[PDB]
Design a protein around this ligand. Sequence first.
Ligand code: NA
Ligand code: NA
Ligand code: NA
Ligand code: NA
Length: 327
Amino acid sequence: PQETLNGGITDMLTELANFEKNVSQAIHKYNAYRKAASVIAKYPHKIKSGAEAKKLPGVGTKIAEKIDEFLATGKLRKLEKIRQDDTSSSINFLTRVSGIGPSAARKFVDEGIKTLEDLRKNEDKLNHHQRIGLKYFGDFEKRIPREEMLQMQDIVLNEVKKVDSEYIATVCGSFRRGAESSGDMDVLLTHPSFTSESQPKLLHQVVEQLQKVHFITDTLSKGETKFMGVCQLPSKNDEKEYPHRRIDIALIPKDQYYCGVLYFTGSDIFNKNMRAHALEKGFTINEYTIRPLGVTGVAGEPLPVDSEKDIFDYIQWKYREPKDRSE
DNA sequence: CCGACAGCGCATCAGC
DNA sequence: GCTGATGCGC
DNA sequence: GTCGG
Ligand code: NA
Ligand code: NA
Ligand code: NA
Ligand code: NA
């Protein structure tokens, strides 16, 4: 629905969510507020009272009260107060830097480091990830047009195949469901040589090649199975340079690849439904495998999965195009 | 009433 | 030095 | 903060 419908309420709950996560370090309250904000964001009527809102799953007594105060006064005293709070607002803000979580943000503010400028001034107090996060603070908050995602995909698929044409790489996330923009790029990689029962350089060789053609520009973390870093499309020679983007690359055993593609394609709501449906059919589906459940609930050995559809077939679901997995 | 609310890789800390 | 915990991100 | 065993 139009954001003007209940935007004031959903904005309020999202702000409350952020303070719970970043300042109070109450992750479950953060999630409670987010869930309330989502269910309301989807509600196709302008809410007139807290009681009305309380009918929606995830909206309880306290949020109903807050909605009543917001409807009557156009604000919430508690939120107004924390907004103006120098320490709390700075803590909340610093967590926007990738690599600075609630613990680091609190420590920085405790010692008088409150702004990006302060961070810029205190490099030796930042770890590698945090320096990269500061360096690209603005770029990381920008979204990526699908057209750019397509150019990025072109490069990733090309270089992967160049390293070894037996690699399989899939760009997942909402991009794969056809979204018009992305927050970052999520690449799942496999190779027939690598199974759950079977090399510690399969990922490295790919990351290296992407660095050699100057696509990958920085590394946040790199192990044998997961890479997280930064990339940038080549500039059109005279055109303004593209923003640096977050890209993750994960190596997954071949026998677990398609479970991974399904999972990381989502959406999150689709995943919940498919997993439920799988249960009532006597299957357990997670990120890695689908397994049968015996009559007393004992999980059997993972079943053979050679495609996304193999998974749909097990639980008697008709195959669903990623474009159709909004829920 | 009171516990669940996901789980795991990687970088780094804390303890030995 | 080694192991396990913690912070962080997803 | 909300849900539910
Ligand atoms: Na409710
Ligand atoms: Na952060
Ligand atoms: Na953040
Ligand atoms: Na080849």
